[PDB]
Design a binder for this molecule. Structure first.
Ligand SMILES: N=C(N)NCCC[C@@H]1NC(=O)Cc2cccn2C(=O)CN(Cc2ccco2)Cc2ccccc2CSC[C@@H](C(N)=O)NC1=O
Ligand SMILES: *[C@@H]1O[C@H](CO)[C@@H](O)[C@H](O)[C@H]1NC(C)=O
Ligand code: NA
Lengths: 30, 258
């Protein structure tokens, strides 16, 4: 609903998965 | 998923398995977009060339799973389907244009640590995130490679597989295939000279292509695994249903029947 897309075992506990950084890097790096 | 890796537990809580009821058979990936709605590829339900024509009663879904085959008590949940909705202008003949379907759960599913919905994108998120070279994430329990071999056959995984792949320029997409592609699909994958690889594969059909917004930290489903020429071939790309472009159809259906 309004809580969509925030994962109980990651975002909600301030924890990152092992590869999400790769996506963020793709947004920034030329 | 070809050239992916084991998912972490609860990495993809919106992940859904689509099964044929009888005989029991994993058909496709899918995703949870609300407590009672599941998104998937139209071709998972209807594909004349392959004699596929499933209706609500032929199917069930499994939510919260990690392992492909093991039963996972107190984590996974099973649901039947009230109705199936295939996009009226789905074109299986020419180009799998509008390869999208919605599945209403007969009974709402309970959210948990292992079961949580994904966001559908608004105009801004789509316009911001859907750019050539930006990567999304594809997940599924489909085959590990295109061709059969003796080592577990075509290779099927123990646990949910994950791979990240960059969105590709539409000219490159269009040049890669004889098929007349439309604005309702995009393509993703490394180029030959990029020297990373990865792709969806047979059985990943209908599962989600997700991106994490750096604006609000939320995961959005931009794509549905749709079609490709084999898996992980050089100079070929996976095609994905453009979720944002079909959001009005999604919303009209959720409104009129939910
Ligand atoms: N690598 C991926 N990300 N995904 C591909 C998984 C793996 C992929 N499978 C699908 O996409 C299956 C599917 C569901 C519904 C259709 N549809 C098809 O194969 C349909 N055509 C013809 C077509 C294209 C657009 C509209 O219809 C795919 C195709 C396109 C161009 C040239 C050849 C082909 C057939 S390639 C061999 C074929 C097979 N003999 O299994 N398919 C695959 O290898
Ligand atoms: C699929 O099955 C239903 C009957 O359950 C039928 O009414 C429909 O026309 C079929 N679609 C085809 C053959 O394309
Ligand atoms: Na490729």
């Amino acid at each position: 609903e309004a809580d969509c897309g925030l994962r109980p075992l990651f975002e909600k506990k301030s924890l990152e998965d092992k590869t999400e950084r790769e996506l963020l890097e793709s947004y920034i790096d030329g | 998923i070809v050239e992916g890796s084991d998912a972490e537990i609860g990495m993809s809580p919106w992940q859904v398995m689509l099964f044929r009821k009888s005989p029991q058979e994993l058909l496709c990936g899918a995703s949870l977009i609300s407590d009672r709605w599941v998104l998937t590829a139209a071709h998972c339900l209807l594909y004349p060339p392959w004699d596929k024509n499933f209706t609500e009663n032929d199917l069930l879904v499994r939510i919260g799973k990690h392992s492909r085959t093991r039963y996972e008590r107190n984590i996974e949940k099973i649901s039947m389907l009230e109705k199936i909705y295939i996009h009226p202008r789905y074109n299986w003949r020419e180009n799998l244009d509008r390869d999208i379907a919605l599945m209403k759960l007969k009974k709402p599913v309970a959210f948990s640590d292992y079961i949580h919905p994904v966001c559908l994108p608004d105009r801004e998120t789509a316009a911001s995130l859907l750019q050539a070279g930006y990567k999304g994430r594809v997940t599924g329990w489909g085959n590990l490679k295109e061709t059969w071999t003796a080592n577990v056959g075509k290779g099927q995984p123990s646990v949910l597989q994950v791979v990240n792949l960059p969105i590709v320029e539409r000219p490159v997409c269009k040049d890669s295939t004889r098929i007349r592609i439309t604005d309702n699909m995009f393509c993703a994958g490394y180029k030959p000279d990029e020297g990373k690889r990865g792709d969806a594969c047979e059985g990943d059909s209908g599962g989600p292509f997700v991106m994490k917004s750096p604006f609000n930290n939320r995961w959005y489903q931009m794509g549905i695994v749709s079609w490709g020429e084999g898996c992980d071939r050089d100079g070929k790309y996976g095609f994905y249903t453009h979720v944002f472009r079909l959001k009005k159809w999604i919303q009209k259906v959720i409104d009129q029947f939910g």
